[PDB]
Structure 1
């Protein structure tokens, strides 16, 4: 009765957990996300999976979910398998509010989820989490905090992050346009727009096929802002229009 399980937990002849590779392929398939530098604000961008125009889309944000009032997270992976972690981490951040009656610094919260993400790995031959998600928000100490989750258990957090094989071409663009403050939220809007223009193969970079979200720090609001499609339309149109002015070097 020992031959039925595939030994996903047990180590492999390659010297490492073998299922983690296929886990990184699960998030590394169809998942498209990124991050933008944080100077007095931050924004988020993703790809809308729905190609059907008959859909209602009455749920507001599609791939981005709000864990806390002042802090949310981007997610990439299987929908419901991620939705389990949305309400789970939401309850972990809620039981922290149930403790101190005060928001949660992302540091110990991400490491807590990493200790939860290793549960399926370290016992029972369970299937590891096929979802790797980002982190955004603000704290009293470090200000805007942008982190990253890894299937191996590490928090790979950077102020500029990459998710997906198609977004791996943006890392060269991230360091080519790289600056620090310097960068305005508007500059990061055109930065991430040119990221999708280089990576996403959609002709003309259709605005309704990709998800965009922002965040601001206000006293004491600190609103996580879901944006209408009107400003994104004119944003990408004004972006490729600025690119039409960037081809004048010839």
Structure 2
């Protein structure tokens, strides 16, 4: 090209290839890292909240990691403003699935329902593209614990370790590298989660004001999802902290 034929999504690209999506991917990198690691009794999500400021009202512990359903939770990397419509939408879909199927909703099914809305916005209706990558964490009895990655465009993939945010390229390779398979436990995936989160992020300290950590753990055959509170979060950070400290001068 030499000029876009976009300026609306009710008019389209001078190549028919959508530039806006590549700027959206860059948008996840602007925002803080989101990572998901797999465990053999749970799955956990670790995300960097928008708020770093000391003054926090703290009525919410969920401000980027939202528990949607009685089987699944998701996280946001990107603009916070976008999650609010999405999170309420996800709640509707998630319970919608239960009504008909009444099964521990699989991660692949929830993500495909959402991808229908994101692909339409980019095609028509004059709505601006999304700028969030969401990580869905859940349990089904047919493959186990799963992690899925959704992109602004509607592009999806099942992972068991994936990271986006604070330069995606580096982060996904690193998360993989430190990940091990079938050697894991929930406490050690959590200790590791802070460590990797620390390296991708500029900070070498990190606090529960900066970070918000969620578990999804299966107990007595049913999935209990909680986003953890600050004192509990701090304990995972301090566990990591001794190691981080030795790296430093």
Preserved CA contact (<8 Å) 1:78 1:130: yes
Q: Which one has the bigger strand percentage?
A: 2
Relative to structure 2, which stretch is displaced further, 173-182 or 68-77? 173-182
- Gapped regions of structure 2 (runs ≥ 5): none
The DSSP-based 3-state class of the residue aligned with 2:37 is: coil
* Cα root mean square deviation, aligned: 3.3
Partner residue in 2 for 1:27: 28
Aligned residues: 248
Larger radius of gyration: 1
User: How far apart, in 2, do the equivalents of 1:24 and 1:245 lie?
Assistant: 34
Preserved CA contact (<8 Å) 2:67 2:226: no
The DSSP-based 3-state class of the residue aligned with 1:176 is: helix
Preserved CA contact (<8 Å) 2:50 2:80: no
User: How far apart, in 1, do the equivalents of 2:220 and 2:186 lie?
Assistant: 18
Pairwise CA distance, 1:39 = 1.8
Partner residue in 1 for 2:103: 102
- Gapped regions of structure 1 (runs ≥ 5): none
Q: What TM-score do the two structures reach when normalised by structure 2? A: 0.86
Preserved CA contact (<8 Å) 1:36 1:160: yes
User: How far apart, in 1, do the equivalents of 2:229 and 2:93 lie?
Assistant: 30
Preserved CA contact (<8 Å) 1:135 1:146: yes
Preserved CA contact (<8 Å) 1:148 1:161: yes
Where in structure 1 do 4 or more consecutive aligned residues deviate above 6 Å?
1-5, 245-248
Preserved CA contact (<8 Å) 2:150 2:156: yes
Preserved CA contact (<8 Å) 1:44 1:213: yes
User: How far apart, in 2, do the equivalents of 1:16 and 1:50 lie?
Assistant: 35
Label 1:61 to 1:24 Cα distance change in 2 as closer, same or farther (>3 A): same
Label 1:194 to 1:137 Cα distance change in 2 as closer, same or farther (>3 A): same
User: How far apart, in 1, do the equivalents of 2:82 and 2:150 lie?
Assistant: 15
> Which whole-Å deviations, capped at 9, do the CAs of 1:192-230 have from their partners, x for residues lacking one?
121122122224223331111111111244211332333
